[PDB]
Amino acid sequence: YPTKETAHWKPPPWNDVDPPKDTLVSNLTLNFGPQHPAAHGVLRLVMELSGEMVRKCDPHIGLLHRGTEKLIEYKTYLQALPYFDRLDYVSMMCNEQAYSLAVEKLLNIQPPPRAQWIRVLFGEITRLLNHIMAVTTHALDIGAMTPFFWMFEEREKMFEFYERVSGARMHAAYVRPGGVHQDLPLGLMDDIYEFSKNFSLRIDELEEMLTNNRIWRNRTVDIGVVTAEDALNYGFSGVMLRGSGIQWDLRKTQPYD
Amino acid sequence: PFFDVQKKLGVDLDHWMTIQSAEQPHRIPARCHAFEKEWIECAHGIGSIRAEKECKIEFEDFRECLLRQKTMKRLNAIKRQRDKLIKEGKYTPPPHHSGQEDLRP
Amino acid sequence: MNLMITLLTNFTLATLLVTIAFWLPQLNVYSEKTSPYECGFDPMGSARLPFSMKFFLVAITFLLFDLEIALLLPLPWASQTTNLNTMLTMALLLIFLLAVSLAYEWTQKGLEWTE
Amino acid sequence: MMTYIVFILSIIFVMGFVGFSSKPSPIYGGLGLIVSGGVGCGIVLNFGGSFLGLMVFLIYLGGMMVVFGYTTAMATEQYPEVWVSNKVVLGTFITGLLMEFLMVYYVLKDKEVEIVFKFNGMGDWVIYDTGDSGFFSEEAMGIAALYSYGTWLVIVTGWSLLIGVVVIMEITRGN
Amino acid sequence: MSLVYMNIMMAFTVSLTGLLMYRSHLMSSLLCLEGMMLSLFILATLMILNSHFTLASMMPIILLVFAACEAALGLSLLVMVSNTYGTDYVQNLNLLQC
Amino acid sequence: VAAFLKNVWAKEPVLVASFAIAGLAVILPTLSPYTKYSLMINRATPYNYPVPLRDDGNMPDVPSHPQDPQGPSLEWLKRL
Amino acid sequence: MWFEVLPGIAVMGVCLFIPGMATARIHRFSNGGREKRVAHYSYQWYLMERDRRVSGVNRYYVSKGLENID
Amino acid sequence: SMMRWNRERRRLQIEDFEARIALMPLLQAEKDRRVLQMLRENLEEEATIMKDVPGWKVGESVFHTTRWVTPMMGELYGLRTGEEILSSTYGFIWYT
Amino acid sequence: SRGEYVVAKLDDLINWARRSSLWPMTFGLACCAVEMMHMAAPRYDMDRFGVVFRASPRQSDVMIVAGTLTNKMAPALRKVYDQMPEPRYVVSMGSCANGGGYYHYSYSVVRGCDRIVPVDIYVPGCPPTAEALLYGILQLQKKIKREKRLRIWYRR
Amino acid sequence: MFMINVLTLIIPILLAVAFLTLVERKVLGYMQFRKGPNVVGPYGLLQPIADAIKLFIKEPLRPATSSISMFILAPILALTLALTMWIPLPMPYPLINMNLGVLFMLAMSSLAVYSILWSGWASNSKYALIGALRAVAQTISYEVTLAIILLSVLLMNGSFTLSTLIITQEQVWLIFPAWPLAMMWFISTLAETNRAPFDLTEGESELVSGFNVEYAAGPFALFFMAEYANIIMMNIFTTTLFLGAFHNPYMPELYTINFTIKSLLLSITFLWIRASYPRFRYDQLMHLLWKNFLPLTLALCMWHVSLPILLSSIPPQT
């Protein structure tokens, strides 16, 4: 018997199963902003999460956009040389080497052999500095802070080498187009030899405290797996390619000095 | 449908708990074990109608052991009359109810 | 009686330090100091939104296992009985039923988190 | 006044019950039920059963924290009516508190009230016992005798809990 | 009887009127249900400890065990309800009216 | 069944140890002979008061003094 | 060297030495030169109040020997 | 080692329980006499208070039997001061 | 008399307790952040002086601006400075935070962080050495020691 | 003279909390190739005083979007729960002798979580709610295994009384017949006290400062001394459980000094654990106490139920 109240009463479905009526689930949008020890200085990760599983990451960058490559155009080559120290402030001398190699290729001149050997040796020293900072800061982000203080003494020793050879601890402005700015002071290579003698044991104790710990393994065994094809397609280079199984290295395939 | 299985099979599942006068761990007696014993033995095998007619005295005495209505009622009467007598001024408490009397043991 | 004196002493020790931490120093309160902290930027929505939880099944079985261990705590007194074989059998059977429930959850992927 | 200790604990018990039975917000309902569980543990501890009070306190604290996680996941809104934020919640809280204090004043004046049963006016120290318990605690020995007497109770409780795990796992399946 | 019984049953009646009048939140009614079971626990153990029924001391543990089991069942049903609709409001359970 | 035991000890040794410990705890009170001594120790603990029986005249087994020879003694609890 | 933390460690040592020794001395003073009675069960409580009643000082640690009797 | 020490502790526990059992009759006699004396003191003062109230009979038992019942806590300490109330009723539970 | 003596002693006490418990927040942007955490290395070890990092702005005392302050960063820096409870102190590190440094004429670089926050100590260099930053921290401590807040209150 | 006893219990524990902050900062300096605070005073003995005075003259900073009642109530509850935690601990005589002290610690361990939860909820922050739900998950991970470990250990004691735990191991240490239970107990109290590698609540890397990311000075110090009192008493609880010392009723100071040295060494090992390992995930911890500790604990509970029946070694309950 239909009435006024029983006017919108539809019959139930034949299978008694309703459509799911999917309302918006209201994912929480967190802001992993720049004032955060996890973000490397300035990184505004706008992060859409379902509680804690990540659904979307949008890293807003440009908070450290100084506009280097316009002031470079407004200055000469020697004046634009210190601009390359401050791009990668923990791999400065390799940036100096890249800029010098580009300018030397454009100028059709080559450095002397001693400048080349000094360049390669100090590039390896800079690689040591960068890898120390990378591994120790990754461990500090995970939670193990002892290797950071353990190897930053060695980082201070290589900074002392930088200051002895150039007069500045970080931004040396030492590798220039045409070679290097100054010759090595006397007695530098012996101290390099002592430091290289002990650094194997330093790496050994860092590895012993990190590479076998099951808490360290659980945070790294199946995290951020990248296949080889997407590593090639996304423009990944270096350690990502070599860790995904791609046998690629610029020091072996397209060699310099 | 009280399909009584326990007496048919000979096992007991909740018979040891159902009354206050059953077997206890190292024979700890309840407060009204004797009254429950008297009421239970008064009204065994006579049915519920004859239980409420012919064991009213035992049951009401047991119920007074359980909740103690009349005991606190008499205590309330004594307490109220003593307070009114104290307030009016016709009574003084004895020294052994005041705090010291060189107690017995 | 001594426990309530101890609890009250602890409570008025705790509330004395808070009350002297709110009225003593000089205050400069503005409509920027008390904003929520979102790593330097303005938040995108409220903090009272539904924060969805993935470990709901583990919480429900935490209730059930908390009650299982609540049943299990009379064991030091129950070891002082005379019917020792029946007590031992019921203790073992209760713990075995707890382990059976845990194993059934383990084999059915109940402990694995959703999404 | 100190003879009315269980009376004061029961008045805090009813105060928490009417605080959380107004249903303001399940966070504050959780706080109210935590208060009620703690003071109920207190009440049953002055009656002698310390083990039972500690168990009910521990069990309710665990359950209340899990359900707090649930309402932070599920039962929450933009502006939770914590208290005083809604008219009906404040009205029913005040109504319950006024009714409770009214009957407390009534029983502390006539020393006898009749709501459907009949309740006496003195403290509950009168209904205690003057004897000793010897070298054992009655409640601990009863729950110890759960294992040696109550085998059927153990069987039905364990089976109910195991199938309860099965029930909750086959409920949250989705298909 | 004693006035502690008055307050315990009065708390039970408060939580009973709380459960039977909904406030558009199912979880609050679940909390009222746990309040009622807590009141039953307190009342039972008060009389059991007063009358020295020592064998009945195992009972309120079992009662609270089944209380928590039915609470867990209620929470699971609430997960299903909140996974169907946006929220846990009791007015959304009105499909069975036609 | 030896290959399965080797595999499960190679993969999850904690579950193997737990299963071994639980099996040990289940099957040891059946075969051990010291449990009856525990039963008698629990039985011989005097929680209550040993109320005496009225001497009708025919009860020579029950003693009349705690230092009488007849009755249940606890020498085995001293020796064990 | 590594023994310069030992000032703070020794300060923690005496700070944890303080409360236990304080409770021991307070228990030994407020109970007539003896250990505090431990009343776990009601039999011990009844005995303690029995001493409280026989002592006649309303202080149970005042202990009457067999010289009280005739 | 734990087995040896636990068996020794059980022997010591049995010795303590035997000492308590030997002490029981004297304490029971004093408890009976103290309870009866306190009931007689409460009854003798009950007549002095109840003189004006009509329809009252002193020493009335609320039970229908002549069997001796255990004295209620309020039937013993009903007329005494609150210090004894707190010392007897809640005294053991509150004691530390 | 006696009141000036009492407020001078109280000023000395609170100045010592504030200058010996500086908690800087974990805040860096650029090269100068690497030099700051090289000051926190075991060679110099600012934890000796009671100086220990605290990541949240609510539990920090001194803000160290180390790096280049761009236009996209200035509202975030200002907000984080505002959420820091009183008393708060600001130390400027490097030429970027001092006056823009290399990128003074850049279109998207704030010429000095003093346009945004009130700065107490300016530490010059590019990067200033770890000894230079420790010198700046000790200068800030000595500046805190010379505060006469309760003396000013008593005189006013 | 009970109030004097209460004061002489509650003042030295917070003094030792401040000096534990000193010692922790010094050890956390000295393991990582550097020094601790040694500038403020003679070998840095005045650093906790300076920290304490500094935190009580800073701004209180109650947020506008936060519910003020629970915001103020939570640190009071945290400090009071840490302070009443210490009451039945026998050193060698507890402040309050209790028949069931172990269940009192368990109930107050359940209650102390609520301070963290309500401080996370009241401060209207997403990071605070994240820290609160991580605390919830941590509690539902550890609590069952903690209670059942303590149950299966106390079966050889005979009762829940802590003073009986001195007598029950006066011959040999209780760490010998329950060494696996000792290790899982140590891990469970590492997880209970929110210390590394199971921090997961005050994470300075996944979050900024956790549930107290909005708490300014003063109220934040309440959580600091609450946590440090928690770690000291939990090491003391472990020392009483497994490392009981020789007790002379005529000279209690021998037991006090033995117990104090053992608990100090346990706290040194606690800070040693702090500066050695990376932090877990908050779901890897849930798969640790459930998939690895709980089955072995159920097996050990079967073993420790059957074993006193096996060897006729049932301890007295008196």
Ligand SMILES: CCCCCCCCCCCCCCCCCC(=O)OC[C@H](COP(=O)([O-])OCC[N+](C)(C)C)OC(=O)CCCCCCCCCCCCCCCCC
């Ligand atoms: C207080 C006194 C001292 C306490 C001891 C501990 C002090 C030293 C602490 C060291 C640092 C610890 C830092 C935190 C570490 C947290 C991680 C962790 O421990 O995880 C647990 C780890 C977990 O291992 P996992 O994380 O590698 O798990 C792998 C899991 N799968 C395979 C699924 C990937 O270990 C355990 O769970 C073991 C628990 C203890 C087992 C004890 C067994 C005792 C022996 C039994 C018998 C054996 C013989 C054979 C059978 C015989 C039968 C008769």
Ligand SMILES: CCCCCCCCCCCCCCCCCC(=O)OC[C@H](COP(=O)(O)OCCN)OC(=O)CCCCCCCCCCCCCCCCC
């Ligand atoms: C009878 C003894 C008493 C029994 C009752 C008391 C038991 C106490 C212990 C309770 C344990 C509860 C949890 C059990 C879970 C078992 C199922 C399971 O989860 O297996 C998984 C595991 C392989 O791991 P995986 O598949 O990777 O798991 C997913 C992520 N871990 O799978 C495995 O590792 C294999 C599991 C099955 C085989 C175990 C064999 C153990 C043998 C020990 C020696 C013999 C002991 C004597 C008794 C016979 C036992 C079979």
Ligand SMILES: CCCCCCCCCCCCCCCCCC(=O)OC[C@H](COP(=O)(O)OCCN)OC(=O)CCCCCCCCCCCCCCCCC
């Ligand atoms: C009516 C009469 C009373 C009037 C009110 C005043 C009462 C006393 C107030 C407290 C003491 C006030 C004086 C404070 C120190 C004054 C002198 C001073 O500043 O000395 C500086 C000196 C360190 O020199 P610095 O410049 O740091 O050197 C670098 C290292 N080469 O510093 C040092 O060498 C060490 C300084 C230590 C300061 C004292 C110790 C700390 C404070 C203790 C008391 C307050 C706290 C009590 C407990 C609170 C709860 C924990």
Ligand SMILES: CCCCCCCCCCCCCCCCCC(=O)OC[C@H](COP(=O)(O)OCCN)OC(=O)CCCCCCCCCCCCCCCCC
């Ligand atoms: C709004 C937020 C909340 C704000 C207020 C917070 C208040 C403080 C909260 C923390 C404390 C909660 C305490 C809860 C009850 C704990 C009971 C307890 O500790 O019992 C231990 C002990 C057991 O005694 P037993 O082992 O039997 O030995 C005696 C035999 N001679 O017992 C004894 O030794 C007996 C000592 C006397 C006991 C008296 C009865 C208990 C008093 C409870 C007072 C109210 C507590 C309210 C807690 C609210 C928590 C939210």
Ligand code: SF4
């Ligand atoms: S001042 Fe120099 S060293 Fe510092 S951030 Fe700027 S460019 Fe880098």
